[PDB]
Enzyme design. Structure first.
Site, mmCIF file in Angstrom:
data_model
loop_
_atom_site.group_PDB
_atom_site.id
_atom_site.type_symbol
_atom_site.label_atom_id
_atom_site.label_comp_id
_atom_site.label_asym_id
_atom_site.label_seq_id
_atom_site.Cartn_x
_atom_site.Cartn_y
_atom_site.Cartn_z
ATOM 1 N N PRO B 1 0.855 -1.213 0.000
ATOM 2 C CA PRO B 1 0.000 0.000 0.000
ATOM 3 C C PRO B 1 0.880 1.248 0.000
ATOM 4 O O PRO B 1 2.037 1.192 0.461
ATOM 5 C CB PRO B 1 -0.827 -0.047 1.277
ATOM 6 C CG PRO B 1 -0.932 -1.534 1.581
ATOM 7 C CD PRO B 1 0.296 -2.177 0.971
ATOM 8 N N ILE B 64 -3.700 -2.163 -4.245
ATOM 9 C CA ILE B 64 -4.429 -3.175 -5.054
ATOM 10 C C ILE B 64 -5.456 -3.925 -4.201
ATOM 11 O O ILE B 64 -5.143 -4.372 -3.106
ATOM 12 C CB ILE B 64 -3.448 -4.164 -5.692
ATOM 13 C CG1 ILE B 64 -2.424 -3.441 -6.562
ATOM 14 C CG2 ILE B 64 -4.254 -5.179 -6.490
ATOM 15 C CD1 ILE B 64 -1.338 -4.337 -7.066
#
Lengths: 117, 117, 117
Positions: B1, B64
């Site tokens: 992230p 994602i």
């Protein structure tokens, strides 16, 4: 193209003229003229990359047309990593890139948007 | 992230080690390993939040898979607000978060993109 | 709305109160209340715009609903260029804007997301 580079290197450890050399590099890599390349460098930030505060850099690349597939971005990535690892004296583990496609209605230029130019 | 935090707190009012503690917090909240968390803190900016220049912070979270629905982002928001209000000593009215889903072809790592890793 | 301005002007050449005057300008241009406008100004950066390191500014505008078409963004662009060229004493060749539509599930506010408020 728009290039934004965040780094935890202090301003006095970023090589003089990096923002200009990155214009010339991006021109050759992305196949756009150097006079349409825009570079923003933000040094002296507090960063962790992969959980570690060792020197690192994050690059964001945004453009119309040319950063929208895995096969194109694999090539761009290889060339940008070669350029940045040498200029910043960082290992390849200390750089990440994000690619963002843009459309012409998103870009404001000379008081209009690119759709009308 | 990827976590990016902009604040109008000066660098000397941001707690030492925030970028490392935010890696550990994000790991637990988003369910990804701390060694895949990337944090950028940009202090000392000029900011208005909700029209007011009182101390404030803006957080951007990109990843994602895990920031792409209202139900997931409601949970993440609750946990990030608890972490940041305590670390920065800000009220909940002085923080906003933006969530951005990414795809693997957008992330340049070790001279390629994540699609091929 | 979220407005982010990057500039290579040093902090002591950015007019005092710009972040507050930009809230009022954005309110009128985008048709949202000034108390829902968020402004981030990042001065003193290293920038090239159109290949040149002369003083310049990059503005990013993100909002729900109102920045998602060419016809809307042409109008917004004209008004933001008028405001910024006067406030920063820059020519229109030294400013670019990017527009980003947001959805309510992307905005974290008061420990939830806007979908639920």
């Amino acid at each position: 193209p728009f290039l934004e580079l965040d780094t935890n290197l202090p301003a006095n450890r970023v090589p003089a003229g990096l923002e200009k050399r990155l214009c010339a590099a991006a021109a050759s890599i992305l196949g756009k003229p150097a006079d349409r390349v825009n570079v923003t460098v933000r040094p002296g930030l507090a960063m962790a990359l992969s959980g570690s505060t060792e020197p690192c850099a994050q690059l964001s690349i945004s453009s119309i047309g040319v950063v929208g597939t895995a096969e194109d971005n694999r090539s761009h990535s290889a060339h940008f990593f070669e350029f940045l690892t040498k200029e910043l004296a960082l290992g390849q583990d200390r750089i990440l890139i994000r690619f963002f496609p843009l459309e012409s209605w998103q870009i404001g230029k000379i008081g209009t948007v690119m759709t009308f130019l």
